[PDB]
Design a protein around this nucleic acid. Structure first.
Ligand code: CA
Ligand code: CA
Ligand code: ZN
Ligand code: ZN
Ligand code: ZN
Ligand code: ZN
Ligand code: ZN
Lengths: 131, 512
RNA sequence: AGAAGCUAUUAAAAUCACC
RNA sequence: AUGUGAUUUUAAUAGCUUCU
């Protein structure tokens, strides 16, 4: 009964991150000390020619980016614990996420450390031009 | 294959999930999955009202991170923490309506003796969050499980059975240790039942204190030691251990019931966690006491041992000088340490096994009543801390009375108990049938020290030439009170002295 | 077209633990 | 209208290789 979701390569990182008082810090510490990133992320076959935005309802991917499904990059959605966002609503789940392709082998570790520029909707420092 | 039972979606909806709001690639439906890379079909919209019971079954805590302690431990690090063993067994209920495929925890039980029923509660993955909430459940089928039929009509929500696990653990392990070693038999459903009340994290220290931080508080994001955890709900770093990976083949009640005939009533949680701790005390301590593993000093460890050494030094010399035994045997004395060196008896060391030295030619012999009932007839045999079923008619026995409960005397296998004081002694059950050839010992103090020159004390128990006269000297009154303090603190600690039939306290008087 | 061997996909049964 | 698994078997379905 049921349709399996995980692979045994991600179990050792899912279990350890399932128990944590702070889910963001524990993934970074797993990544630093001999840790393989979370595999099996959801990836979108976009036209890969589109205007860049971090979070969109339809995948808008620039040529230097890869658009992932926003439920497989939010670590808190991904371990089934409660989001630390106020109103307890995930921002990323439901919308299509975007991750720069130089660091898109590990999406979850991109969405934990980086942030979205409020005035132009781009990833701050990764093409955000707010000088 | 390369699949795992972890986070296995247990809904009965035929369709899958949208490309977004799906946790992994294997959970997306077939309509979107093309060459391992999902496509956004703009025609099919996403679900906005749906509930899927995620199955938290199959956790594997084999991680290795630098600052984070490991949950599972090796059995040379669980014998060093034996004051912090709390058995754990969880009886589950299956989800029957609108979700099938996971065993939600129903009944938690500990070695303390406290059953905590919980409502069936699972991780329902809503559109916007993971809604930890009540799911519908049925108790297991069969006449093997019929005492879980009423329990699903009672229980508490998981925000009161998270605080009655940290109000019970904190009252049990307040004085034993500063960590907790959850002795589990399964290694599966227990871990599944530890998603609910355990949060591992980096090694922390108690707020406004100094002890290890073992209790988390989700309301106020702080940590506590076992003394200050009033109202704190999440257990911080526990340690666990799996007994089935020690080479056991078979059921629990067919491996406990070969060693113990006191526990019973299996498949109740408090009687699965009692058998699980009973068997794990057996598999580590009943073989022989291990003299290499020292233990911390909880309290009164220095005074009790020195008082025992004082009274054992006293009673042997009194019985030897009073009855003039030609030879004195010894049993169970691991080293060769002469208790009374200024004696005339020949100390034949009939040890149980040779322990790390043959410099004194300690003999090897095991004792049983029906075997050696007529082997030792000469003299007296000092069974200090021996564990034989029955003692012969000439002995000086000191047996630990295993019915007294204290912070020293942890409960143990077959009604006998584990007396962990600077070493671990697994003393067997204290039965009266062992002492049918012996009697109790009166209280008395005897010394050959000459009297030197305050409340006057008149007691016929003290055996000195000063108290035989009218005036009791001050060079013996403090001796008598110190000896009385040592004797009463020892008897309160739980030992029990026994002596042979012909012990006469008046034979000591004519020696003067 | 079949056979033989190896790895995998699904289904049924057996044994074992947990419930 | 099927409780978790693990290990064996036994059937079929895919490949990969060899032979006839
Ligand atoms: Ca169990
Ligand atoms: Ca059980
Ligand atoms: Zn999220
Ligand atoms: Zn910007
Ligand atoms: Zn404290
Ligand atoms: Zn038992
Ligand atoms: Zn005196």
């Amino acid at each position: 009964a049921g349709n399996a979701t995980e692979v045994p390569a991600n179990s050792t990182v899912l279990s350890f991150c399932a128990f944590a008082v702070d889910a963001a810090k524990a993934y970074k510490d797993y990544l630093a000390s001999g840790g393989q990133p979370i595999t099996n992320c959801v990836k979108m076959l976009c036209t890969h020619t589109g205007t860049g935005q971090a979070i969109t309802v339809t995948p808008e991917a620039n040529m230097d980016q890869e658009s992932f499904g926003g439920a497989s990059c939010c670590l808190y959605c991904r371990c089934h614990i409660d989001h630390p966002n106020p109103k307890g609503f995930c921002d990323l789940k439901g919308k299509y996420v975007q991750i720069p392709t130089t660091c898109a082998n590990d999406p979850v570790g991109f969405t934990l450390k980086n942030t979205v520029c409020t005035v132009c909707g781009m990833w701050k420092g990764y093409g955000c031009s707010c000088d | 294959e390369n699949v795992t039972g972890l986070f296995k979606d247990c809904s009965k909806v035929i369709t899958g999930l949208h490309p977004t709001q799906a946790p992994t690639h294997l959970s997306v439906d077939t309509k979107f999955k093309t060459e391992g890379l999902c496509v956004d079909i703009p025609g099919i919209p996403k679900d906005m009202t749906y509930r899927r019971l995620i199955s938290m079954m199959g956790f594997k805590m084999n991680y290795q991170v630098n600052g984070y302690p490991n949950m599972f431990i090796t059995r040379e690090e669980a014998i060093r923490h034996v004051r912090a063993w709390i058995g754990f067994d969880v009886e589950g209920c299956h989800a029957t309506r609108e979700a099938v495929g996971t065993n939600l925890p129903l009944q938690l039980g500990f070695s303390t003796g406290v059953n905590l029923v919980a409502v069936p509660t699972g991780y329902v993955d809503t559109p916007n969050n993971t809604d930890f909430s009540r799911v519908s459940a049925k108790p297991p089928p069969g006449d093997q499980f019929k005492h879980l039929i009423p329990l699903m009509y009672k229980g508490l929500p998981w925000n009161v059975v998270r605080i009655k696990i940290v109000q019970m653990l904190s009252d049990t392990l307040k004085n034993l240790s500063d960590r907790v070693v959850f002795v589990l038999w399964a290694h599966g459903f227990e871990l599944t039942s530890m998603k609910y009340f355990v949060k591992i994290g980096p090694e922390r220290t108690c707020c406004l204190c100094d002890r290890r931080a073992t209790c988390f508080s989700t309301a106020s994001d702080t940590y506590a030691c076992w003394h200050h955890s009033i109202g704190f709900d999440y257990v911080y770093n526990p340690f666990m251990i799996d007994v089935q990976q020690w080479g056991f083949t078979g059921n629990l009640q067919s491996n406990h019931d070969l060693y113990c005939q006191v526990h019973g009533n299996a498949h109740v949680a408090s009687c699965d966690a009692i058998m699980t701790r009973c068997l794990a005390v057996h598999e580590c301590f009943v073989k022989r006491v291990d003299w290499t593993i020292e233990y911390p000093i909880i309290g009164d460890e220095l005074k009790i041992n020195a008082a025992c050494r004082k009274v054992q030094h006293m009673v042997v010399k009194a019985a030897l000088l009073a009855d003039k035994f030609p030879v004195l045997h010894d049993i169970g004395n691991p080293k060769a340490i002469k208790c009374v060196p200024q004696a005339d008896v020949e100390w034949k060391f009939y040890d149980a096994q040779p322990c790390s030295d043959k410099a004194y030619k300690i003999e090897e012999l095991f004792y049983s009543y029906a075997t050696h009932s007529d082997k030792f007839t000469d003299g007296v045999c000092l069974f200090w801390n021996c564990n034989v079923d029955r003692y012969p008619a000439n002995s000086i026995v000191c047996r630990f009375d295993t019915r007294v409960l204290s912070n020293l005397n942890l409960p143990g296998c077959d009604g006998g108990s584990l007396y962990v004081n600077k070493h671990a002694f697994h003393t067997p059950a204290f039965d009266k049938s062992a002492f049918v050839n012996l009697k109790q010992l009166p209280f008395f103090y005897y010394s050959d020290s000459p009297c030197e020159s305050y409340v006057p004390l008149k007691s016929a128990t003290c055996i000195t030439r000063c108290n035989l006269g009218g005036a009791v000297c001050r060079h013996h009154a403090n001796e008598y009170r110190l000896y009385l303090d040592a004797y009463n603190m020892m008897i309160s600690a739980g030992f029990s002295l026994w002596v042979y039939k012909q012990f006469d306290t008046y034979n000591l008087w004519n020696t003067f």
